Enzyme design. Structure first.
Site, PDB file in Angstrom:
ATOM      1  N   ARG A  82       0.845  -1.184   0.000  1.00 46.19           N
ATOM      2  CA  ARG A  82       0.000   0.000   0.000  1.00 46.19           C
ATOM      3  C   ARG A  82       0.885   1.241   0.000  1.00 46.19           C
ATOM      4  O   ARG A  82       0.821   2.059   0.921  1.00 46.19           O
ATOM      5  CB  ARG A  82      -0.933   0.025   1.218  1.00 46.19           C
ATOM      6  CG  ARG A  82      -2.134  -0.908   1.123  1.00 46.19           C
ATOM      7  CD  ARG A  82      -3.357  -0.259   1.751  1.00 46.19           C
ATOM      8  NE  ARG A  82      -3.008   0.536   2.928  1.00 46.19           N
ATOM      9  CZ  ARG A  82      -3.825   1.412   3.506  1.00 46.19           C
ATOM     10  NH1 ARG A  82      -5.038   1.611   3.014  1.00 46.19           N
ATOM     11  NH2 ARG A  82      -3.426   2.093   4.575  1.00 46.19           N
ATOM     12  N   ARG A  92       3.219  -0.310   8.264  1.00 46.17           N
ATOM     13  CA  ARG A  92       2.753  -1.575   7.695  1.00 46.17           C
ATOM     14  C   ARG A  92       3.355  -1.724   6.305  1.00 46.17           C
ATOM     15  O   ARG A  92       3.211  -0.833   5.473  1.00 46.17           O
ATOM     16  CB  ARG A  92       1.231  -1.588   7.599  1.00 46.17           C
ATOM     17  CG  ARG A  92       0.499  -1.501   8.931  1.00 46.17           C
ATOM     18  CD  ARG A  92      -0.146  -2.829   9.294  1.00 46.17           C
ATOM     19  NE  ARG A  92      -1.565  -2.664   9.603  1.00 46.17           N
ATOM     20  CZ  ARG A  92      -2.446  -3.660   9.637  1.00 46.17           C
ATOM     21  NH1 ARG A  92      -2.058  -4.908   9.389  1.00 46.17           N
ATOM     22  NH2 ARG A  92      -3.717  -3.411   9.924  1.00 46.17           N
ATOM     23  N   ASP A  95       7.764  -6.495   2.155  1.00 46.11           N
ATOM     24  CA  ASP A  95       9.194  -6.462   1.868  1.00 46.11           C
ATOM     25  C   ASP A  95       9.535  -7.674   1.016  1.00 46.11           C
ATOM     26  O   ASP A  95       9.164  -8.790   1.364  1.00 46.11           O
ATOM     27  CB  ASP A  95       9.980  -6.491   3.178  1.00 46.11           C
ATOM     28  CG  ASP A  95       9.680  -5.290   4.064  1.00 46.11           C
ATOM     29  OD1 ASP A  95       9.614  -4.165   3.519  1.00 46.11           O
ATOM     30  OD2 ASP A  95       9.509  -5.467   5.288  1.00 46.11           O
ATOM     31  N   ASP A  97      13.082  -9.051  -0.657  1.00 43.38           N
ATOM     32  CA  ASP A  97      14.497  -8.799  -0.793  1.00 43.38           C
ATOM     33  C   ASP A  97      15.198  -9.970  -1.423  1.00 43.38           C
ATOM     34  O   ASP A  97      14.933 -11.140  -1.078  1.00 43.38           O
ATOM     35  CB  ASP A  97      15.119  -8.560   0.579  1.00 43.38           C
ATOM     36  CG  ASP A  97      14.578  -7.323   1.252  1.00 43.38           C
ATOM     37  OD1 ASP A  97      14.915  -6.208   0.811  1.00 43.38           O
ATOM     38  OD2 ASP A  97      13.828  -7.466   2.227  1.00 43.38           O
TER      39      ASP A  97
END
Ligand SMILES: [Cl-]
Length: 158
Positions: A82, A92, A95, A97
């Site tokens: 968001r 919030r 992620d 990676d």
């Protein structure tokens, strides 16, 4: 090439956020999910009523170059997070990676692999160990030894 990707979310109902990210990862061009770890739970820091983070590790086979894969993981993070509705930072977040990419060491402004702090994050290492117990980092360190020698927060499954 096998790349290892960390997924983390404390957004909405995290279970389905993460499932959406997984579907998106599988839809990356020239790339295929080999395996996914169990889902783990990291509590927020401090007394505040904040949502827990759901953590997972993914082994993704890919013929993309590392920065091409990065374009996609960054894209998915944007699209599923968001960011537009809320803010870049959080609190919030979703992620994604790139933790590892084959046996490559990459040191560029855009991309550092291995992920710079992964050896200190139990929420990255434990899920990674679940799916890759024999893993050896580019510098020669054995994942199995790092987990025997470093202090990490207790990490329960979701
Ligand atoms: Cl390394």
């Amino acid at each position: 090439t096998v790349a290892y990707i960390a997924i983390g979310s404390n957004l909405a109902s995290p279970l389905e956020q993460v499932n959406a990210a997984l579907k998106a990862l599988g839809d990356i061009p020239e790339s295929h999910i080999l395996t996914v770890s169990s889902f783990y739970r990291t509590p927020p820091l401090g007394p505040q009523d904040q949502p827990d983070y759901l953590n997972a590790a993914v082994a993704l086979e890919t013929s993309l170059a590392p920065e091409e894969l990065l374009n996609h993981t960054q894209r998915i993070a944007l699209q599923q997070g968001r960011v537009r509705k809320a803010e870049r930072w959080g609190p919030r977040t979703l992620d994604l990676d790139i933790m590892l990419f084959g046996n490559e060491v990459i040191n560029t402004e855009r991309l550092t692999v291995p992920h710079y702090d992964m050896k200190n994050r139990g929420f990255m290492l434990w899920p990674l160990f679940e799916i890759a117990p024999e893993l050896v980092f580019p510098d020669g360190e054995m994942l199995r030894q790092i987990l025997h020698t470093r202090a990490f927060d207790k990490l329960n499954k979701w």
